[PDB]
Structures are given as C-alpha cells and as structure tokens.
C-alpha cells in the first residue's frame, strides 16, 4: 500500500527469486511471506497461490504478488 | 554409471561458458542457462531442487565441483 511496503515487498520477492527470472515458485511464496514477518497457514497460502497463479504454472510474478498482498 | 570423459568435458565447457571472469564460479541465476546450453530443459521444480543442491552455502555462487557432482547424481 505505501511506498515503504512496496519497496519491502519488492526486496523480499527478489531475495527469493533464486533462478533470477522475475518470478517465484509457489513454494518460495511461503518463505517470502515469512520473510516479511507474516505467518500464513497452508490453507491461506494455497488460496493465495490459486488466485495469483492465473496461468497455473506454479510461478507468480511481482505484479501478481503485489496485488495479492494488497487484498490482505 | 560412472561419468565418461565426454560428459565431464561437456559439463565443464558449459559451466565455463558462463564464467566470463574465469574464476571458476558462476551464479545460481545462471544454473538454468547452463542446463539449457547442454540441451536440457529443467522444469521450475527441477531447477529449484538443483539450485538447492549446488549452493549449499547459499551465497548465490556455484563452483564446478559442486555443479559436476549434482549432474552425476541427476544422471539418467
Ligand atoms: Mn524465479
Ligand atoms: Mn503463473
Ligand atoms: Mn556469467
Ligand atoms: Mn566472479
Ligand atoms: Mn566467475
Ligand atoms: Mn555458493
Ligand atoms: Zn480465493
Ligand atoms: Zn503476471
Ligand atoms: Zn523460475
Ligand atoms: Zn565448492
């Protein structure tokens, strides 16, 4: 929501994009969220995942991550 | 099956295609590209696993011995 939050989301997302392609895997998402000091359950995570991952390929880009976080 | 000289030579050649400063290290961000340069096409899940295996210290950089032994394990 704020510029602070956006920059922090961006840094965490990038920190865990291990293959450096601008996306993170669904597995990396839980870690990214814990790195932001949040604690989603698997149930929470998986719906989030199902919502962001439109093309259903197991990865999500930053715009998708960002808007998911905004809705929460 | 123990590695052949041809296999080791090709893994080395591919690794070193992406070590332009010639210090024997590449980044994990390049591992996928190395694999594709060998004609392979690891899925997002396979590459996640390989990156985990080869960068055990997580500093984001990989050397040839660690890359090679990963390939030997992965061998068909
Ligand atoms: Mn990625
Ligand atoms: Mn996707
Ligand atoms: Mn390079
Ligand atoms: Mn270097
Ligand atoms: Mn190097
Ligand atoms: Mn390393
Ligand atoms: Zn939902
Ligand atoms: Zn997208
Ligand atoms: Zn990826
Ligand atoms: Zn080493």
PDB file of C-alpha atoms and ligand atoms in Angstrom:
ATOM      1  CA  UNK A   1       0.000   0.000   0.000  1.00  0.00           C
ATOM      2  CA  UNK A   2       2.688   2.545   0.968  1.00  0.00           C
ATOM      3  CA  UNK A   3       5.961   3.120  -0.902  1.00  0.00           C
ATOM      4  CA  UNK A   4       7.707   1.556   2.090  1.00  0.00           C
ATOM      5  CA  UNK A   5       5.598  -1.593   1.777  1.00  0.00           C
ATOM      6  CA  UNK A   6       6.061  -1.764  -1.993  1.00  0.00           C
ATOM      7  CA  UNK A   7       9.847  -1.497  -1.697  1.00  0.00           C
ATOM      8  CA  UNK A   8       9.868  -4.134   1.035  1.00  0.00           C
ATOM      9  CA  UNK A   9       7.681  -6.486  -0.972  1.00  0.00           C
ATOM     10  CA  UNK A  10       9.993  -5.957  -3.934  1.00  0.00           C
ATOM     11  CA  UNK A  11      13.153  -6.668  -1.978  1.00  0.00           C
ATOM     12  CA  UNK A  12      11.758  -9.834  -0.348  1.00  0.00           C
ATOM     13  CA  UNK A  13      10.407 -11.159  -3.677  1.00  0.00           C
ATOM     14  CA  UNK A  14      13.748 -10.556  -5.369  1.00  0.00           C
ATOM     15  CA  UNK A  15      15.687 -12.008  -2.455  1.00  0.00           C
ATOM     16  CA  UNK A  16      13.991 -15.369  -3.035  1.00  0.00           C
ATOM     17  CA  UNK A  17      13.897 -15.404  -6.834  1.00  0.00           C
ATOM     18  CA  UNK A  18      16.789 -17.892  -6.806  1.00  0.00           C
ATOM     19  CA  UNK A  19      16.854 -18.586 -10.550  1.00  0.00           C
ATOM     20  CA  UNK A  20      16.711 -14.865 -11.317  1.00  0.00           C
ATOM     21  CA  UNK A  21      13.830 -14.908 -13.844  1.00  0.00           C
ATOM     22  CA  UNK A  22      11.498 -12.380 -12.195  1.00  0.00           C
ATOM     23  CA  UNK A  23       9.100 -14.978 -10.822  1.00  0.00           C
ATOM     24  CA  UNK A  24       8.948 -17.025  -7.648  1.00  0.00           C
ATOM     25  CA  UNK A  25       7.659 -20.549  -7.254  1.00  0.00           C
ATOM     26  CA  UNK A  26       4.603 -21.340  -5.134  1.00  0.00           C
ATOM     27  CA  UNK A  27       6.952 -22.863  -2.571  1.00  0.00           C
ATOM     28  CA  UNK A  28       9.068 -19.703  -2.430  1.00  0.00           C
ATOM     29  CA  UNK A  29       5.896 -17.703  -1.671  1.00  0.00           C
ATOM     30  CA  UNK A  30       5.523 -19.036   1.867  1.00  0.00           C
ATOM     31  CA  UNK A  31       9.155 -18.119   2.536  1.00  0.00           C
ATOM     32  CA  UNK A  32       8.749 -14.637   1.054  1.00  0.00           C
ATOM     33  CA  UNK A  33       5.769 -14.082   3.315  1.00  0.00           C
ATOM     34  CA  UNK A  34       7.566 -15.383   6.418  1.00  0.00           C
ATOM     35  CA  UNK A  35      10.489 -13.089   5.459  1.00  0.00           C
ATOM     36  CA  UNK A  36       8.030 -10.196   5.709  1.00  0.00           C
ATOM     37  CA  UNK A  37       7.269 -11.422   9.234  1.00  0.00           C
ATOM     38  CA  UNK A  38       3.884 -12.820   8.313  1.00  0.00           C
ATOM     39  CA  UNK A  39       2.578 -16.265   9.140  1.00  0.00           C
ATOM     40  CA  UNK A  40       0.049 -17.641   6.648  1.00  0.00           C
ATOM     41  CA  UNK A  41      -1.239 -21.192   7.062  1.00  0.00           C
ATOM     42  CA  UNK A  42      -1.115 -23.658   4.165  1.00  0.00           C
ATOM     43  CA  UNK A  43      -4.816 -23.066   3.572  1.00  0.00           C
ATOM     44  CA  UNK A  44      -4.245 -19.324   3.321  1.00  0.00           C
ATOM     45  CA  UNK A  45      -1.158 -19.786   1.139  1.00  0.00           C
ATOM     46  CA  UNK A  46      -2.835 -22.194  -1.283  1.00  0.00           C
ATOM     47  CA  UNK A  47      -5.840 -19.940  -1.983  1.00  0.00           C
ATOM     48  CA  UNK A  48      -3.439 -17.037  -2.434  1.00  0.00           C
ATOM     49  CA  UNK A  49      -1.476 -19.260  -4.807  1.00  0.00           C
ATOM     50  CA  UNK A  50      -4.615 -20.338  -6.683  1.00  0.00           C
ATOM     51  CA  UNK A  51      -5.650 -16.677  -7.057  1.00  0.00           C
ATOM     52  CA  UNK A  52      -2.323 -15.189  -8.204  1.00  0.00           C
ATOM     53  CA  UNK A  53      -1.277 -18.068 -10.474  1.00  0.00           C
ATOM     54  CA  UNK A  54      -3.663 -17.316 -13.332  1.00  0.00           C
ATOM     55  CA  UNK A  55      -1.741 -19.284 -15.971  1.00  0.00           C
ATOM     56  CA  UNK A  56      -1.483 -22.173 -13.486  1.00  0.00           C
ATOM     57  CA  UNK A  57       2.234 -22.837 -13.988  1.00  0.00           C
ATOM     58  CA  UNK A  58       3.471 -22.864 -10.392  1.00  0.00           C
ATOM     59  CA  UNK A  59       5.039 -19.401 -10.513  1.00  0.00           C
ATOM     60  CA  UNK A  60       3.890 -15.854  -9.777  1.00  0.00           C
ATOM     61  CA  UNK A  61       5.296 -12.508 -10.921  1.00  0.00           C
ATOM     62  CA  UNK A  62       5.710  -9.372  -8.865  1.00  0.00           C
ATOM     63  CA  UNK A  63       2.557  -7.572 -10.046  1.00  0.00           C
ATOM     64  CA  UNK A  64       0.561 -10.667  -9.067  1.00  0.00           C
ATOM     65  CA  UNK A  65       2.333 -10.955  -5.708  1.00  0.00           C
ATOM     66  CA  UNK A  66       1.847  -7.262  -5.031  1.00  0.00           C
ATOM     67  CA  UNK A  67      -1.893  -7.193  -5.677  1.00  0.00           C
ATOM     68  CA  UNK A  68      -2.433 -10.373  -3.654  1.00  0.00           C
ATOM     69  CA  UNK A  69      -0.701  -8.703  -0.691  1.00  0.00           C
ATOM     70  CA  UNK A  70      -2.851  -5.601  -1.143  1.00  0.00           C
ATOM     71  CA  UNK A  71      -6.033  -7.655  -0.827  1.00  0.00           C
ATOM     72  CA  UNK A  72      -4.624  -8.886   2.506  1.00  0.00           C
TER      73      UNK A  72
ATOM     74  CA  UNK B   1      27.016 -45.453 -14.478  1.00  0.00           C
ATOM     75  CA  UNK B   2      30.301 -43.679 -13.776  1.00  0.00           C
ATOM     76  CA  UNK B   3      30.823 -40.390 -15.689  1.00  0.00           C
ATOM     77  CA  UNK B   4      32.594 -40.523 -19.038  1.00  0.00           C
ATOM     78  CA  UNK B   5      35.324 -38.132 -20.141  1.00  0.00           C
ATOM     79  CA  UNK B   6      32.965 -36.727 -22.817  1.00  0.00           C
ATOM     80  CA  UNK B   7      30.336 -35.952 -20.169  1.00  0.00           C
ATOM     81  CA  UNK B   8      32.802 -34.268 -17.825  1.00  0.00           C
ATOM     82  CA  UNK B   9      34.268 -32.236 -20.692  1.00  0.00           C
ATOM     83  CA  UNK B  10      30.812 -31.066 -21.810  1.00  0.00           C
ATOM     84  CA  UNK B  11      29.700 -30.170 -18.308  1.00  0.00           C
ATOM     85  CA  UNK B  12      32.930 -28.223 -17.872  1.00  0.00           C
ATOM     86  CA  UNK B  13      32.606 -26.467 -21.228  1.00  0.00           C
ATOM     87  CA  UNK B  14      29.007 -25.475 -20.482  1.00  0.00           C
ATOM     88  CA  UNK B  15      29.819 -24.262 -16.942  1.00  0.00           C
ATOM     89  CA  UNK B  16      32.684 -22.171 -18.198  1.00  0.00           C
ATOM     90  CA  UNK B  17      30.583 -20.586 -20.968  1.00  0.00           C
ATOM     91  CA  UNK B  18      29.036 -18.577 -18.151  1.00  0.00           C
ATOM     92  CA  UNK B  19      32.164 -17.892 -16.039  1.00  0.00           C
ATOM     93  CA  UNK B  20      33.414 -14.902 -18.048  1.00  0.00           C
ATOM     94  CA  UNK B  21      35.741 -13.637 -15.295  1.00  0.00           C
ATOM     95  CA  UNK B  22      37.385 -17.069 -15.316  1.00  0.00           C
ATOM     96  CA  UNK B  23      37.431 -17.549 -11.545  1.00  0.00           C
ATOM     97  CA  UNK B  24      35.695 -20.933 -11.554  1.00  0.00           C
ATOM     98  CA  UNK B  25      32.441 -19.644 -10.109  1.00  0.00           C
ATOM     99  CA  UNK B  26      29.082 -18.807 -11.689  1.00  0.00           C
ATOM    100  CA  UNK B  27      25.849 -17.584 -10.074  1.00  0.00           C
ATOM    101  CA  UNK B  28      22.754 -19.690  -9.244  1.00  0.00           C
ATOM    102  CA  UNK B  29      20.849 -17.345 -11.531  1.00  0.00           C
ATOM    103  CA  UNK B  30      22.923 -18.836 -14.354  1.00  0.00           C
ATOM    104  CA  UNK B  31      22.417 -22.531 -13.498  1.00  0.00           C
ATOM    105  CA  UNK B  32      19.253 -22.738 -15.612  1.00  0.00           C
ATOM    106  CA  UNK B  33      21.094 -21.243 -18.582  1.00  0.00           C
ATOM    107  CA  UNK B  34      23.969 -23.718 -18.197  1.00  0.00           C
ATOM    108  CA  UNK B  35      21.413 -26.543 -18.261  1.00  0.00           C
ATOM    109  CA  UNK B  36      19.747 -25.193 -21.376  1.00  0.00           C
ATOM    110  CA  UNK B  37      23.164 -24.821 -23.028  1.00  0.00           C
ATOM    111  CA  UNK B  38      23.547 -28.588 -22.569  1.00  0.00           C
ATOM    112  CA  UNK B  39      20.285 -29.101 -24.399  1.00  0.00           C
ATOM    113  CA  UNK B  40      18.363 -29.796 -21.220  1.00  0.00           C
ATOM    114  CA  UNK B  41      15.151 -28.103 -20.139  1.00  0.00           C
ATOM    115  CA  UNK B  42      14.635 -28.460 -16.391  1.00  0.00           C
ATOM    116  CA  UNK B  43      11.186 -27.571 -15.093  1.00  0.00           C
ATOM    117  CA  UNK B  44      10.787 -24.898 -12.455  1.00  0.00           C
ATOM    118  CA  UNK B  45      10.680 -27.670  -9.804  1.00  0.00           C
ATOM    119  CA  UNK B  46      13.791 -29.476 -11.040  1.00  0.00           C
ATOM    120  CA  UNK B  47      15.792 -26.241 -11.144  1.00  0.00           C
ATOM    121  CA  UNK B  48      14.664 -25.314  -7.635  1.00  0.00           C
ATOM    122  CA  UNK B  49      15.967 -28.684  -6.478  1.00  0.00           C
ATOM    123  CA  UNK B  50      19.273 -28.340  -8.377  1.00  0.00           C
ATOM    124  CA  UNK B  51      19.922 -24.841  -7.033  1.00  0.00           C
ATOM    125  CA  UNK B  52      19.286 -26.144  -3.509  1.00  0.00           C
ATOM    126  CA  UNK B  53      21.814 -28.958  -4.059  1.00  0.00           C
ATOM    127  CA  UNK B  54      24.669 -26.988  -5.627  1.00  0.00           C
ATOM    128  CA  UNK B  55      24.655 -23.850  -3.472  1.00  0.00           C
ATOM    129  CA  UNK B  56      24.757 -25.433  -0.032  1.00  0.00           C
ATOM    130  CA  UNK B  57      26.179 -22.213   1.473  1.00  0.00           C
ATOM    131  CA  UNK B  58      23.502 -20.089  -0.232  1.00  0.00           C
ATOM    132  CA  UNK B  59      25.875 -17.231  -1.111  1.00  0.00           C
ATOM    133  CA  UNK B  60      24.374 -17.349  -4.605  1.00  0.00           C
ATOM    134  CA  UNK B  61      27.529 -18.655  -6.293  1.00  0.00           C
ATOM    135  CA  UNK B  62      28.460 -22.136  -7.584  1.00  0.00           C
ATOM    136  CA  UNK B  63      31.739 -23.818  -8.376  1.00  0.00           C
ATOM    137  CA  UNK B  64      32.431 -26.599 -10.825  1.00  0.00           C
ATOM    138  CA  UNK B  65      32.991 -29.473  -8.388  1.00  0.00           C
ATOM    139  CA  UNK B  66      29.543 -28.868  -6.817  1.00  0.00           C
ATOM    140  CA  UNK B  67      27.896 -28.470 -10.224  1.00  0.00           C
ATOM    141  CA  UNK B  68      29.538 -31.658 -11.551  1.00  0.00           C
ATOM    142  CA  UNK B  69      28.571 -33.889  -8.636  1.00  0.00           C
ATOM    143  CA  UNK B  70      24.963 -32.654  -8.913  1.00  0.00           C
ATOM    144  CA  UNK B  71      24.961 -33.630 -12.581  1.00  0.00           C
ATOM    145  CA  UNK B  72      26.391 -37.048 -11.737  1.00  0.00           C
ATOM    146  CA  UNK B  73      23.574 -37.624  -9.233  1.00  0.00           C
ATOM    147  CA  UNK B  74      20.953 -36.452 -11.721  1.00  0.00           C
ATOM    148  CA  UNK B  75      22.267 -38.724 -14.487  1.00  0.00           C
ATOM    149  CA  UNK B  76      19.855 -40.982 -16.388  1.00  0.00           C
TER     150      UNK B  76
HETATM  151 MN1  LIG C   1      12.368 -17.205 -10.151  1.00  0.00          MN
HETATM  152 MN1  LIG C   2       1.926 -18.339 -13.048  1.00  0.00          MN
HETATM  153 MN1  LIG C   3      28.462 -15.230 -16.352  1.00  0.00          MN
HETATM  154 MN1  LIG C   4      33.367 -13.879 -10.133  1.00  0.00          MN
HETATM  155 MN1  LIG C   5      33.075 -16.399 -12.363  1.00  0.00          MN
HETATM  156 MN1  LIG C   6      27.726 -20.993  -3.017  1.00  0.00          MN
HETATM  157 ZN1  LIG C   7      -9.528 -17.461  -3.244  1.00  0.00          ZN
HETATM  158 ZN1  LIG C   8       1.526 -11.755 -14.220  1.00  0.00          ZN
HETATM  159 ZN1  LIG C   9      11.831 -19.709 -12.315  1.00  0.00          ZN
HETATM  160 ZN1  LIG C  10      32.832 -25.820  -3.650  1.00  0.00          ZN
END
